[PDB]
Amino acid sequence: ESAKIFKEFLEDYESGKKSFREASYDATVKLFLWFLPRNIELAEIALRWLIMLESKKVSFEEASLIALREALRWFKVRNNELYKIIKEALDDYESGKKSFEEALWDYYEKVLEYLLK
């Protein structure tokens, strides 16, 4: 069920039905609801991303950077596979190798392949 959240992101973004930020926003909302009965601090990371977006005081990029760096610290001592995917997405974006949208786009389809494999 977690996989579909990322599949429906790629479906709605690559189709052009939704902008990147609208598709990523809905993906994060589904992830927060999916985390509520399974992981509270992971739901806390996703929720503060929502509060950052809803507070209208944080940009989409800075809020995503803040939430990604906290998930990277959480996965650092629990899952090296997911730590690798978050670090590479931050690396590619903060190094200018990729734009913000395409670095996270790869992150969403690379998190999907991890759940599938």
Can you spell out the DSSP letters for 72-106? HHHHTTT-HHHHHHHHHHHHHHHTTSS-HHHHHHH
Q: In a 3-state reduction of DSSP, which class is residue 82? A: helix
Resolution of the model in angstroms? 2.0
What residues make up the domain containing 59?
Answer: 2-116
State the total domains in the chain: 1
- CB count within 10 Å of CB 87 equals 15
30 vs 24: CA distance, rounded Å: 10
Question: Both tokens of residue 71?
Answer: 């998930």
50 vs 1: CA distance, rounded Å: 21
